C-alpha cells in the first residue's frame, strides 16, 4: 500500500530538522497516521473548490485556498 512509501528514514529526516535526537520504533507507524489524516482534511476542501467550478483538475490555487481555509496558509504559490 502506497502510504508505506513514507519510508522510515524520511520520517527520521523530518524529525531531525525538528531537532529530536532519538526515535522510538513506535513513532514510524504512528506518524503516518497524522500525515494521512492531514492530507485527508485538505484534499476534501481542494476537491470541493474544484467541483464548485466544474473543472476536473486540481490546481495549485485550489490547494492554496484549502490550506488558507484551515489556518495553515502558504506564501509561495499565489496569495
Amino acid at each position: 500500500d502506497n502510504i508505506q512509501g513514507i519510508t522510515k528514514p524520511a520520517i527520521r529526516r523530518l524529525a531531525r530538522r525538528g531537532g529530536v535526537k532519538r526515535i522510538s520504533g513506535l513513532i514510524y507507524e504512528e506518524t503516518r497516521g497524522v500525515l494521512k489524516v492531514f492530507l485527508e482534511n485538505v484534499i476534501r476542501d481542494a476537491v470541493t473548490y474544484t467541483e464548485h467550478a466544474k473543472r476536473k483538475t486540481v490546481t495549485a490555487m485550489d490547494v492554496v485556498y484549502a490550506l488558507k481555509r484551515q489556518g495553515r496558509t502558504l506564501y509561495g504559490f499565489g496569495g
Binding site: A10, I27, I43, V58, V63
Partner: protein, 97 residues
C-alpha cells in the same frame, strides 16, 4: 574507529536544520495524494504544481509537530520521543480529541 551513539544524531540535526530541501521522495508522495483523492472524486487530474504545494505544506506540518513533540519528551525527563508524546502535543493543540 567508530563514534559514540549520540554523535551522529547531533551531526544530522546540524545538517537537516541548515538545508531547506524537500525530505520525502517525490513519486512516493505523489502516489499517496492520488490514492487519498480518488476516494472522494473518481478520475481526477492534478496540475504538476498542485502536488508540490501539498508537499511543501505537509513537510512544514510534520516538522512543526515534531518540534512541539520534543518539548513534551524533554519535559518528561526523557530525550527519546514515543507515541505517548505526540498524543499529548496533538491534544493540547486541539486536533484529535
Amino acid at each position: 574507529h567508530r563514534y559514540r551513539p549520540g554523535t551522529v544524531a547531533l551531526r544530522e540535526i546540524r545538517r537537516y536544520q541548515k538545508s531547506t530541501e524537500l525530505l520525502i521522495r517525490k513519486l512516493p508522495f505523489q502516489r499517496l495524494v492520488r490514492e487519498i483523492a480518488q476516494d472522494f472524486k473518481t478520475d481526477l487530474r492534478f496540475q504538476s504544481s498542485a502536488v508540490m504545494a501539498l508537499q511543501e505544506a505537509c513537510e512544514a506540518y510534520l516538522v512543526g509537530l515534531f518540534e512541539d513533540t520534543n518539548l513534551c519528551a524533554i519535559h518528561a525527563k526523557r530525550v527519546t520521543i514515543m507515541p505517548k508524546d505526540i498524543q499529548l502535543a496533538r491534544r493540547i493543540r486541539g486536533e484529535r480529541a
